[PDB]
């Protein structure tokens, strides 16, 4: 968060999989593997998203065949808030401990 102290706010983090299209209502979403949090003293917070797939793997690339994605459509939402509209909730990304990467492929990238 980055906003004032007079800006108490609440967010959500849903994670749905392949087989259905992502929600748009934390209500419908509260049925995936999620979690709720609210601004405080400590600011940051890092949620690890699960490794779920038939094959223990799957690709980093993609096709107009995979528009149904073999790995899901993670989706973040927003509960309620207070004088906390227009604030900054920047999200970053690191490798969790479970993370792994293999099979070197070089192929034109700029």
């Amino acid at each position: 968060f980055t906003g004032p102290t007079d800006a108490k706010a609440r967010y959500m983090i849903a994670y749905a999989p392949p087989g259905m299209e992502p929600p748009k209502t934390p209500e419908a979403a509260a049925h995936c593997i999620h979690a709720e949090w609210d601004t405080g003293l400590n600011s940051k917070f890092t949620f690890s998203i699960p490794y779920l797939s038939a094959a223990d793997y799957a690709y980093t690339a993609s096709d107009t065949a995979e528009t149904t994605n073999v790995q899901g459509w993670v989706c973040l939402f927003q509960i309620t808030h207070g004088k906390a509209d227009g604030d900054a909730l920047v999200v970053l990304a690191s490798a969790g401990k479970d993370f792994e990467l293999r099979l070197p492929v070089d192929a034109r990238t700029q």
Binding site: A30, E36, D38
Partner: protein
């Protein structure tokens, strides 16, 4: 900015966090009545799969909003997921609503809602509304908490309660002190409610939609 107090509560895969914590309170019980009863004759099983959080909306605590508005919310209630399908494929069962209630404004407003989780009922006398202070309940105030939380046990009238036509648990939040936007305070507080059904087991079963 204090003694410091945070907390996250996991139920299945769902996990509500908070910082304006204040704590909690379990009332009446803390346990559960031996759910290995006679009426279920061993024919009962644990389904701690649907044991987790779902969202439903309470009213909107607004400045005007009188000293009484206590948006009710029966528990059980409409379930678009697990626990609901369970009640549709089952007759007899019993659980325990977790309930972790939030209401976001900020640390500048006035007033307080009164959160409570009471059993069997029908309707309440206003003159009685001065004693929610008798059943599992919490107290909200933006100058200490943003969250409530109070975890309710199983009461029912029986060991294994049926919900197609009965709802032992009800949730009310009467406005004990009206809301004041003030100088720099927030504009409005929509009271949101996060619930979860715990230690629940079933017994019984019907045919199918076909």
């Amino acid at each position: 900015l204090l003694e410091d107090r945070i907390l996250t509560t996991r139920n299945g895969h769902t996990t509500s966090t908070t910082q304006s914590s204040v704590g909690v309170t379990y009332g009446y019980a803390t346990a559960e009545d031996f759910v290995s009863g006679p009426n279920t004759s061993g024919l009962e099983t644990r389904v701690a799969q649907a044991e987790r959080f779902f969202k439903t909306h309470l009213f909107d605590w607004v400045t005007s909003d009188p000293f009484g508005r206590c948006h009710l919310l029966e528990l059980p209630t409409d379930h678009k997921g697990v626990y609901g399908y369970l009640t549709d494929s089952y007759a007899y069962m019993r659980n325990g609503w977790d309930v972790e209630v939030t209401a976001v404004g900020n640390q500048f407003n006035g007033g307080c809602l009164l959160v409570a989780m009471v059993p069997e009922l029908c309707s309440i006398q206003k003159r009685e509304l001065y004693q929610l202070t008798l059943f599992p309940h919490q107290f909200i105030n933006p100058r200490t908490n943003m969250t409530a939380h109070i975890t309710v046990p199983f009461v029912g009238v029986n060991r294994y309660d049926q919900y197609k036509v009965h709802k032992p648990w009800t949730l009310v939040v009467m406005v004990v002190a009206p809301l004041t936007v003030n100088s720099e305070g927030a504009p409005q507080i929509k009271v949101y409610a996060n619930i979860a059904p715990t230690n629940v087991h079933v017994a019984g079963e019907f045919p199918s939609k076909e």
